[PDB]
């Protein structure tokens, strides 16, 4: 069965796409917001045949226009993820951008793009050549952003740390102690039928990115913003994947005993207030059972009372406790 809705929507966007080639950067951004609203919303079927019209604007001189293109590609991977191999090249290219404001926006977008991209490529039974090449670009995006922890711009470093957090979480296995999160995806959700990549190689990479985050967290000349961001990212990784709990508790212990001498008094207070919150969050996780006394010690050093700390420890039955206590003795 048919109606007029699709043809009327197509005529509305054909006009808007034609205006773009002669429009001002302010008008170009207004037109793109309307094109996105219809082509990825009101009439989602039109998306494929208006892709090149929008992706061409990635080369535009105005940074706001380039940023609007990023917002479009991010939306594509959310609603029409099957189109990922046709938009993913633009993302990798826009990570070479000269504008720091553009790079930051691309890093932000890569969070959902990488997750949606990994989920979609996993689902494919007979993956084509388009799938292998989309995965190659996604692998290169991870390496591109990983390099940006050494970028000279503090904003770029902050965004890069946040991106790397989601990769570790995706490229590790969830367990029974993992914090309950609705859209959570781990290596356990990656099928054995998948030929594109091996679960063990992704785990190896996740472990290497974690090692880089732990090492970055412990440097002497890290900025207060990068340090607070790295601390909360390490906390998210340990509460999501409690296999990394011991390593994260050790990094927090080492930080509190050696605050970078580059921090001002005000920055030390800010870092310590955030660290206190991360330790409270971790102490609520059942997987922090072994480290409860170490966490308590740090929370006492940071000004928490006996009763404030005590209320955070989850209640456990003696059978669960004995299961954990024996496993801790076994692992050693």
């Amino acid at each position: 069965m048919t109606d007029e809705k699709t043809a009327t929507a197509r005529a509305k966007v054909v006009d808007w796409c034609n205006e773009l080639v002669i429009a001002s950067p302010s008008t170009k951004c207004e037109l793109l917001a309307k094109v996105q609203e219809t082509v990825l919303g009101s009439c989602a079927e039109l998306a494929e045949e208006f892709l090149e019209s929008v992706l061409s604007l990635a080369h535009d001189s105005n940074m706001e226009v380039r940023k609007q293109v990023v917002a479009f590609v991010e939306q594509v991977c959310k609603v029409k993820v099957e189109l990922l191999p046709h938009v993913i090249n633009v993302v990798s290219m826009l990570l070479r951008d000269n504008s720091a404001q553009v790079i930051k926006r691309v890093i932000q977008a890569c969070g959902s793009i990488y997750k949606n991209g990994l989920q979609y490529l996993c689902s494919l039974m007979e993956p084509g050549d388009s799938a292998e090449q989309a995965w190659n670009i996604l692998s290169l995006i991870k390496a591109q952003i990983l390099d940006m922890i050494d970028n000279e711009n503090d904003g770029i470093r902050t965004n890069a740390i946040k991106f790397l957090e989601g990769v570790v979480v995706l490229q590790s296995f969830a367990d029974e102690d993992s914090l309950k999160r609705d859209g959570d995806f781990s290596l356990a959700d990656v099928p054995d039928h998948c030929t594109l990549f091996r679960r063990e190689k992704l785990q190896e990479e996740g472990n290497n990115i974690l090692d880089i985050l732990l090492q970055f967290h412990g440097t002497t000349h890290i900025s207060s913003v990068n340090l607070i961001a790295c601390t909360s990212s390490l906390c998210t990784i340990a509460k999501m994947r409690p296999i990394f709990m011991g390593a994260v508790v050790e990094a927090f212990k080492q930080l509190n005993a050696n605050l970078p001498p580059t921090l001002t008094d005000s920055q030390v207070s800010s870092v310590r207030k955030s660290l206190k919150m991360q330790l409270q969050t971790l102490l609520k996780n059942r997987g922090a059972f072994e480290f409860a006394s170490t966490i308590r010690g740090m929370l006492v050093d940071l000004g928490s009372s006996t009763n404030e700390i005590q209320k955070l420890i989850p209640k456990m039955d003696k059978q669960e406790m004995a299961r954990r206590q024996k496993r801790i003795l076994e692992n050693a």
């Binding site: 959902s112 965004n159 946040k162 800010s270």
Partner: protein, 192 residues
């Protein structure tokens, strides 16, 4: 006239945040204001048992309520003067925990508000992976100090608006601002 999305946060969204909202709006900033408290709390006739309202109650209704209770006393302290400016700025006081609005900078007027803002943003999982700078500027909760505080906050935001790359300059800017103004400004980064 910068493109910075700024939010000022206090407890009730009545005195300190609205004073800052007022001056920042006049300076041309994209400014919003919120309260961190459970409910809207205005002072009363004596110590404790003050005027309590739900977040969403119009400033106009709070003006009319205080008018019928005691029109003379609430004019002498200046609460009706305060309620008049707020109705000109916006319809009703808003709660930070319930907003879906995103900002570049969030300014809190006391460490307790700062903790409430930071706890709330952490309680929510990151989607956009968009960072926001959360800053604390201590403002004593009285009409005189809320006015002086609003000048400090406008000052700080204006200095930050001048920067060509706020992320790359913010730590040095705060450090120099703290020195000049003999103040402590707590600064953290949170994510949307």
């Amino acid at each position: 006239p910068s493109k910075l999305a700024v939010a000022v946060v206090d407890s009730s969204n009545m005195n300190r945040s609205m004073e800052a909202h007022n001056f920042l709006a006049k300076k041309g900033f994209n400014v919003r204001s919120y309260g961190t408290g459970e409910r809207v709390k205005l002072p009363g006739m004596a110590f404790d048992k003050p005027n309590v309202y739900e977040f969403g109650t119009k400033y106009e209704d709070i003006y009319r309520d205080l008018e019928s209770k005691d029109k003379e006393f609430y004019t002498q302290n200046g609460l009706l003067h305060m309620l008049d400016r707020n109705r000109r700025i916006k319809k009703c006081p808003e709660r930070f925990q319930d907003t879906k609005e995103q900002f570049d900078i969030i300014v809190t007027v006391e460490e307790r508000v700062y903790d409430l803002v930071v706890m709330h943003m952490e309680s929510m999982e990151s989607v956009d992976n968009r960072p926001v700078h959360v800053l604390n500027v201590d403002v004593v909760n009285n009409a005189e100090d809320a006015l002086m505080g609003a000048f400090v906050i406008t000052d700080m935001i204006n200095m930050m608006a001048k920067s060509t790359d706020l992320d790359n300059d913010i730590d040095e800017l705060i450090q120099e601002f703290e020195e000049r103004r003999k103040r402590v400004i707590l600064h953290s980064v949170l994510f949307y």
